[PDB]
Paper text:
Mitochondrial ribosomes (mitoribosomes) synthesize a critical set of proteins essential for oxidative phosphorylation. Mammalian mitoribosomes assemble in a multi-step process that includes the maturation of two ribosomal RNAs (rRNAs; 12S and 16S), a structural tRNA, and incorporation of 82 mitoribosomal proteins (MRPs). Here, we determine the cryo-EM structures of mitoribosomes isolated from human cell lines with either depleted or overexpressed mitoribosome assembly factor GTPBP5, allowing us to capture consecutive steps during mitoribosomal large subunit (mt-LSU) biogenesis. We purified mitoribosomes from a genetically engineered human cell line that lacks GTPBP5 (GTPBP5KO) and from a cell line expressing 3xFLAG-tagged GTPBP5 (GTPBP5IP), and used single-particle cryo-EM to determine their structures. Both the GTPBP5KO and GTPBP5IP mt-LSU assembly intermediates reveal several trapped assembly factors: the MTERF4-NSUN4 complex, MRM2, MTG1, and the MALSU1:L0R8F8:mt-ACP module.
We isolated mitoribosomes from a cell line with knocked-out GTPBP5 and determined the single-particle cryo-EM structure of the purified mt-LSU assembly intermediates. This approach allows the capture and molecular structure determination of normally short-lived assembly intermediates that do not accumulate in large numbers under physiological conditions. Second, in the GTPBP5KO—but not in the GTPBP5IP—the junction between H89 and H90 of domain V is significantly different compared to the mature mitoribosome. Specifically, at the base of H89, one helical turn remains unfolded and instead forms a loop. In GTPBP5KO, but not in GTPBP5IP, the two N-terminal α-helices extend from MRM2 and insert into the rRNA core to thereby displace and retrieve the A-loop (16S mt-rRNA domain V) through a complex interaction network. This places the 2′-hydroxyl of U3039 close to the ideal methyl-acceptor position in the MRM2 active site. However, there is no density for either SAM or S-adenosyl homocysteine (SAH) in the MRM2 active site and there is no apparent density for a 2′-O-methyl on U3039. Importantly, the striking similarities between the GTPBP5KO and GTPBP5IP structures suggest that GTPBP5KO likely represents a true assembly stage, not an “off-pathway” intermediate accumulated due to the absence of GTPBP5.
Author numbering:
A (entry chain k): 2 to 96
B (entry chain 4): 66 to 103
C (entry chain r): 35 to 41, 47 to 196
D (entry chain I): 67 to 196
E (entry chain N): 32 to 133, 148 to 251
F (entry chain J): 18 to 157
G (entry chain l): 93 to 136
H (entry chain t1): -15 to 30
Amino acid sequence: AAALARLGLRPVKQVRVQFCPFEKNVESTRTFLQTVSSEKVRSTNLNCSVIADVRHDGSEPCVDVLFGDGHRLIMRGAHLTALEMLTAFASHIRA
Amino acid sequence: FKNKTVLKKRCKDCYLVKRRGRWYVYCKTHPRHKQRQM
Amino acid sequence: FREVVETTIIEGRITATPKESPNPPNPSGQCPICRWNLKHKYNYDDVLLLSQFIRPHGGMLPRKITGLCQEEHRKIEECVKMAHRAGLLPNHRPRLPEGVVPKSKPQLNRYLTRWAPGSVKPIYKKGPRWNRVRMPVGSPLLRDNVCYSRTPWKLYH
Amino acid sequence: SPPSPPQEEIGLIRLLRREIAAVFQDNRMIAVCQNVALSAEDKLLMRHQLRKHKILMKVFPNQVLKPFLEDSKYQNLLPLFVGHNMLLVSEEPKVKEMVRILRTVPFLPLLGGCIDDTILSRQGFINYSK
Amino acid sequence: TLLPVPSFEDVSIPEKPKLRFIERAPLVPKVRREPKNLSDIRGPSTEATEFTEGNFAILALGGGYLHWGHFEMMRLTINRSMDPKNMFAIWRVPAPFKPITRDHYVTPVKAGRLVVEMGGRCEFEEVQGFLDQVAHKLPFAAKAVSRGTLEKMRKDQEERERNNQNPWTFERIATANMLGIRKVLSPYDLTHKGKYWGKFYMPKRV
Amino acid sequence: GVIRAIVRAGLAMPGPPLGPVLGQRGVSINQFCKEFNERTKDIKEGIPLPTKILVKPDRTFEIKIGQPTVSYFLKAAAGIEKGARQTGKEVAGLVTLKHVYEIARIKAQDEAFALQDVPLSSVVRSIIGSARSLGIRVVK
Amino acid sequence: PEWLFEMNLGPPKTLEELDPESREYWRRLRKQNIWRHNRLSKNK
Amino acid sequence: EALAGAPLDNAPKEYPPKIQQLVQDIASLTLLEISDLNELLKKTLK
RNA sequence: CCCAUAGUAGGCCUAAAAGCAGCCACCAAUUAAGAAAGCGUUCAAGCUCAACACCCACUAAAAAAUCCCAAACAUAUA
Ligand SMILES: [Mg+2]
Ligand SMILES: [Zn+2]
């Protein structure tokens, strides 16, 4: 979270987190939400909009990231660790 | 660098690495904190 | 085992995770090696044993994942270092970028190499007989190893 | 290793157990929501908003919460309790106001809950509010 | 998991919680009272080996002489890093009385001697820091000890003596004169049991 | 940025205490001091007023005025103008529990005080603690 | 308000005096622990 | 015994067996029994 | 790693010491924060630490003068 705080969310304009709470394989994505929805990272720019769209219907967990440019980052965190997702996100932001 | 028989981290950002067969303190924040094992 | 795939979409896929042999000879053993009665019975040479505890690119696996005894973790760590330096693990070479092609370097056959070759300074002034600077051979961690010969491991040359 | 000598529950553990039982049985409307890392100022003001509409906030450690519900009727709420969590508790199901104030801050997800002795999801919550 | 905190309310602090000034030389010179033949630096200490109205101390693990400089070192270092209200210190060594002429006065210290003592409403870890600092700056080998730590040390030594797998001990051989070994041993070695060699003391020897 | 002060309402200009900080931020001290005048005249005068001001990047002024400090209320209750030096065995003033409750009643109304708790027992417990910190003892 | 009369005075209820299986009991124990930590960390 | 509710979002409103038995009893019962039931329901609430 | 609201800038001395120039008391609200353990400000403002959740693992030195100074070697049964 501190690493993401240092590396501000300048290029990204929108982030969306979708998960099924009853599903056993969502905890990672939930952790990701916990990291991305903090003041330390959110107060870098108010251009970013964090949306949490939690659903009950059986579906694969996934997070969506919209950049200012043509960059588009979707990743399914069903079998992805939170730390791995954060590192990948940071690398994509670096561009 | 300064030679030290005993190495002490002087701040939080100080970090301790073994390079070239000896211990070093490196510090990006405070370059003066740099130390070499003697 | 989990593989991460980037095609921008990133997925995680689980492949065939290998499993332990059906019946260990010593159950109620805390270490993985303690179970197979392999406590003092492995050396740097034993690559079959060592390859099990290493990552594909040659790095050591963490203690918690493998469930190794701390002592035995350290032993395997240094044994794998020696195995690499002896050239016994050719398939576990570092992940070099495709662009980077390693330049030709002079080859020297070595074994039982404790220190990294870069770090060691030459013994220009070896001492008198009574205080002699000796060249280390093999690890002191392997001192407890079973010794068939009557003379113990000569750790310093 | 020789079997680890069992330690008697620290008094706090027992006390904590009682509180959960009381607050859960008394209040009809229970809502599981992810305890997001809001600012202190933000947390206080949203808590005040909930207080105005007579909704109370509680958090309990998973270490004590998990044993309570692992042997109960409400064992279907176990997957809900992963990571940071909080319980929005109310005697009456006043869902409309909490929904409308959560609408302000999108990052907060309503994971689920239990109303009138039946479990419900966020989709079910919005259906019940309508 | 929270744990109960020890209470030191019963503990009382003296009127002078700080180490008193130690004079460079005695006002009136004094003749020898102890026998001349005896070495005042060699062998185990026969006095001030036990804690007196104190919980923590500096234990000497070797023989040596303290100058006025050592006293000043100890005094200044201890007083500076002391909370006067919480903790108090007392000298466990006399003022320098033994003259050296090439004239400066020294005090002898044997192994096992408690050099300084400390007590009050504090734990060992609190005092250990600066006490270890002083111990290092002492001429002989020294370490900070609590009542508990000293007792543990003694128990461990006793345990090692009882536990030893070596059939042959220094004591056994020396007393029985087993290889005609008394030829190369001091008469003092019988009592010292091979633990003491000159002013130096070996804690690792059974 | 949020800045906390207990500038007295009667004295319009803070002067020395708030002088360097406001200068550092670079905001109009005259406007800021004259803002206090309305708040002073609205309520009783000659009493200190704790304020938690909010400074925005566009240099706009947000004034959040909290109720007078607990210290002064307790002093007024005891009838003492100066607090006890020792704060130990020296009791400067005696305040009845009744008056403590009355001041607690009239205190917990503002978010600056931050005691928004429904039971006033918590509030009065805080006040009695504050009284103990001063040279004030409770009776009855 | 009857509970006005029913309140602690002068001496804070001691850890031994305060009953276990109570909220305040653990508050006091935590408070003492932080005091212990602060006292020990003085020289460090 | 657990609620085990909300099996799926697309579930066609599965009902417990307990809620089903009372429906069958009402249908089998005659109008005269239903008439007294309706009158008592009206007395309780309107 | 994570995270930090607030009774209040706790009272006296001090131009003011406001958690950290000094003295006394050391309570108290939330679910959980010491009238603050270490830095930093003329004083403020701030960065940590202990605190709640989250469940992670965490286990000590060296040098000199003609030219280093046996060769070497960890693995066959005292
Ligand atoms: Mg912390
Ligand atoms: Zn540094």
